[PDB]
Amino acid sequence: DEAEASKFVEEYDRTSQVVWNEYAEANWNYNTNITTETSKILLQKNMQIANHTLKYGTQARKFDVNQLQNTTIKRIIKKVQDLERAALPAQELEEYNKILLDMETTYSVATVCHPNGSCLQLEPDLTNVMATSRKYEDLLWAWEGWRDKAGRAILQFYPKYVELINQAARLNGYVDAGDSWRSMYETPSLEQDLERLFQELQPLYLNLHAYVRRALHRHYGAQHINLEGPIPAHLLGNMWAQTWSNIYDLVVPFPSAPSMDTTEAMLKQGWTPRRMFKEADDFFTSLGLLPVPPEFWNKSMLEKPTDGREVVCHASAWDFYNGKDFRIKQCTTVNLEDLVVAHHEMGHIQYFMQYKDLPVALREGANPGFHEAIGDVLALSVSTPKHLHSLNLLSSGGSDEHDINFLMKMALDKIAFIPFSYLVDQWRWRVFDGSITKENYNQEWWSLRLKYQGLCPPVPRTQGDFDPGAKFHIPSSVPYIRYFVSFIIQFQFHEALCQAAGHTGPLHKCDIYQSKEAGQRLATAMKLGFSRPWPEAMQLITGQPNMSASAMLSYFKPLLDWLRTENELHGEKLGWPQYNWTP
Ligand SMILES: O=C(N[C@@H](Cc1ccccc1)P(=O)(O)[C@@H]1CCC[C@H]1C(=O)N[C@@H](Cc1c[nH]c2ccccc12)C(=O)O)OCc1ccccc1
Numbered sequence: 001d002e003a004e005a006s007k008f009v010e011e012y013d014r015t016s017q018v019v020w021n022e023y024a025e026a027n028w029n030y031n032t033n034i035t036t037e038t039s040k041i042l043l044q045k046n047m048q049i050a051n052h053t054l055k056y057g058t059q060a061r062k063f064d065v066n067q068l069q070n071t072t073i074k075r076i077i078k079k080v081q082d083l084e085r086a087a088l089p090a091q092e093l094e095e096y097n098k099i100l101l102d103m104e105t106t107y108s109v110a111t112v113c114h115p116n117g118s119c120l121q122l123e124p125d126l127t128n129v130m131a132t133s134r135k136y137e138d139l140l141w142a143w144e145g146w147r148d149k150a151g152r153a154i155l156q157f158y159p160k161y162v163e164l165i166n167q168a169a170r171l172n173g174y175v176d177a178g179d180s181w182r183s184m185y186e187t188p189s190l191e192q193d194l195e196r197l198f199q200e201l202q203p204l205y206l207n208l209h210a211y212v213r214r215a216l217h218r219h220y221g222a223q224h225i226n227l228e229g230p231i232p233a234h235l236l237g238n239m240w241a242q243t244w245s246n247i248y249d250l251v252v253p254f255p256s257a258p259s260m261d262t263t264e265a266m267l268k269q270g271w272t273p274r275r276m277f278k279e280a281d282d283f284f285t286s287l288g289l290l291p292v293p294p295e296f297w298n299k300s301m302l303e304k305p306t307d308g309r310e311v312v313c314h315a316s317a318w319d320f321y322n323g324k325d326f327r328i329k330q331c332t333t334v335n336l337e338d339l340v341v342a343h344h345e346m347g348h349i350q351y352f353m354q355y356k357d358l359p360v361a362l363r364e365g366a367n368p369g370f371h372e373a374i375g376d377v378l379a380l381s382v383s384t385p386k387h388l389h390s391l392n393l394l395s396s397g398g399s400d401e402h403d404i405n406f407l408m409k410m411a412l413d414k415i416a417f418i419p420f421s422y423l424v425d426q427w428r429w430r431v432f433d434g435s436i437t438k439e440n441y442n443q444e445w446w447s448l449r450l451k452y453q454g455l456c457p458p459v460p461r462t463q464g465d466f467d468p469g470a471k472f473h474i475p476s477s478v479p480y481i482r483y484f485v486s487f488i489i490q491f492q493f494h495e496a497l498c499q500a501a502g503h504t505g506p507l508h509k510c511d512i513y514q515s516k517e518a519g520q521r522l523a524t525a526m527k528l529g530f531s532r533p534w535p536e537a538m539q540l541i542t543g544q545p546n547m548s549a550s551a552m553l554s555y556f557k558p559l560l561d562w563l564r565t566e567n568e569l570h571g572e573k574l575g576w577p578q579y580n581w582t583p
């Protein structure tokens with residue numbers, strides 16, 4: 001029993017390193033150059049990894065996990081018993097593989113053109129229209145156009161995807177795919193936990209929603225904005241209305257206090273994509289944390305290719321499973337937004353390197369949310385006026401008005417995201433559990449878009465529309481609740497790391513730069529990887545075991561007070577009692 005289990009673990013680990021390393025590069029070649037050849041080679045490398053997973057997964061299932069003495073060994077074998085997609089019969093496996101590939105390619109090659117012959121890709125073209133245009137009709141063209149081309153074209157694949165991913169999940173002992181996804185957190189109370197955490201941030205979100213709805217009322221006209229209704233989903237400076245910081249100019253609390261154009265400030269002093277990752281590297285090393293290998297700089301795709309290549313532009317960070325080769329792939333634009341994104345990517349990279357000496361089965365974040373949180377934590381300190389001024393991207397800081405402005409900028413990004421990141425997998429769990437059918441995909445999406453976010457589609461939805469398909473993580477099959485957890489827990493990390501750094505006074509003024517006390521708590525948690533249940537890693541960073549929104553609420557507390565006063569003086573109905581309103 002016990003000695004065979006130890007040998008199995010070792011054999012699995014060394015062989016997976018080879019098989020997963022070979023898969024990583026084939027997958028990289030498809031991502032950095034979408035062709036029919038790299039698509040073929042990947043689908044073939046899917047079959048080799050499936051063979052490995054099946055061989056070792058079948059053998060792991062003959063071990064009684066219950067009889068196993070060693071805790072680490074027992075936790076590995078149990079994980080290896082989950083074949084995931086490899087549990088599918090050969091014919092379904094290759095269909096599910098082609099489906100996943102066809103959804104990725106469809107999303108990534110989608111363009112939106114005018115009759116004049118000019119066509120727009122999502123990054124950077126449609127993305128810039130969403131962020132900078134203040135014309136109702138232009139935003140609507142980019143918003144509808146993206147959903148017409150990407151969303152609609154994903155719909156032919158999705159019901160077959162749901163069937164196959166669910167089947168593989170049943171074959172691994174789960175009730176459905178969303179059940180398999182939720183189990184990554186190892187928390188039976190998970191749904192309740194997240195629901196409570198969502199309700200905690202309701203008052204702060206409803207007040208932000210009401211404040212911004214008024215500002216859109218000012219700008220876009222009383223005829224197009226309902227002050228008791230949902231906000232049209234194309235007016236928030238982002239394609240999915242998931243973050244609202246790009247319309248900051250429309251909502252500035254104190255316009256008498258102008259802040260530098262951080263983007264033109266980056267362009268003015270000749271910031272590059274390379275510079276942005278070099279600065280993220282520096283923030284990571286300032287904490288006493290690992291620098292990126294030299295190899296990283298030679299192998300990563302830090303900017304969008306210009307040699308006429310078709311790519312997956314939605315960013316990702318890569319582990320090639322040898323402990324040396326880690327890469328980022330980003331279609332980077334020189335702005336504050338992608339500087340924050342670069343840090344997110346470098347936190348994934350830092351995580352790979354921190355747990356690189358664990359068995360591969362344990363080479364994961366404490367939970368998926370821990371992995372998304374790490375780069376966002378540093379980025380919170382980066383985005384402070386103090387630190388931005390030190391990068392020469394600002395000129396100051398000080399007055400309670402600059403404070404409210406900075407906090408508003410932060411809330412338009414962080415608070416606005418809470419209902420959205422909660423939504424996606426609420427929709428998807430109900431698609432997976434069978435309660436939402438292909439008949440109700442879209443209607444149920446907008447039902448939740450209304451309920452949680454207070455948004456309405458600017459144009460009524462017709463038959464054949466599949467608006468979830470216009471969002472990366474859906475055709476790409478990436479779980480989303482990881483980002484909801486991340487946004488809550490990053491402020492907990494921030495609060496506790498600020499305490500270690502000896503920050504007194506308001507949390508939003510904290511800048512953990514160069515703190516070896518902050519660095520030590522992240523490194524100690526990250527080195528665990530997936531070895532222990534996550535409340536341990538949570539305890540190690542924050543001195544306690546639970547997820548809480550209190551650290552986030554504390555950070556925005558001065559904004560909540562300002563929003564309440566400001567909304568109360570404008571007589572705003574919080575929420576959307578007239579929910580059925582459509583523009
Ligand atoms: O890079 C990814 N994952 C990403 C996307 C991906 C997943 C799977 C296959 C292919 C690609 P991303 O989250 O970095 C990633 C790439 C750019 C931002 C991130 C994102 O998606 N964010 C969400 C949420 C979001 C909105 N605004 C922001 C701002 C900052 C962070 C997140 C965020 C989004 O909808 O785009 O995976 C790293 C990893 C490997 C192994 C174990 C654990 C983690």
Ligand SMILES: [Cl-]
Pocket residue numbers: 233240467468
């Ligand atoms: Cl949508």
Ligand SMILES: [Cl-]
Pocket residue numbers: 181184368369479480481482
């Ligand atoms: Cl997840």
Ligand SMILES: [Zn+2]
Pocket residue numbers: 344345348371372
């Ligand atoms: Zn991420």
